[PDB]
Design a protein around this ligand. Structure first.
Ligand SMILES: Cn1cnc2c1c(=O)[nH]c(=O)n2C
Length: 114
């Protein structure tokens, strides 16, 4: 059920999303900008292992379209994106190191929800 605080909490989520996409974090956010193109990258098992792909452009579309009804729904998708990275790749992969840094940006600012 919708709460009067949901619009304002979703604005905080939108601010986080804008930050994740910003130049400040681009050195480690870039693998998460667009859907994984598994065929182009030679990752021919990606869709056998990752049943629910997610990326920041999809989060952005869902925000713009008012798909997310509350902050928890938004956070679940961002976390799904990171989890997919932790599931698919070995833990010493550079993309995992980038995911951990971007997730730290996300989690610390999400925790500051007004
Ligand atoms: C999210 N993303 C974007 N590019 C990649 C990945 C990944 O998980 N593994 C991986 O190997 N590559 C190249």
């Amino acid at each position: 059920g919708s709460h009067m605080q949901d619009p304002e909490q979703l604005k905080h989520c939108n601010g986080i999303l804008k930050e994740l996409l910003s130049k400040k974090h681009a050195a480690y956010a870039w693998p998460f900008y667009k859907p994984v193109d598994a065929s182009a990258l030679g990752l021919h098992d990606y869709h056998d292992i990752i049943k629910h792909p997610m990326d920041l452009s999809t989060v952005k579309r869902k925000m713009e379209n008012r798909d997310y009804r509350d902050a928890q729904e938004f956070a679940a998708d961002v976390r799904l994106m990171f989890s997919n990275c932790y599931e698919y790749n070995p833990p010493d992969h550079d993309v995992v190191a980038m995911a951990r840094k971007l997730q730290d940006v996300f989690e610390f600012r999400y925790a500051k929800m007004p």
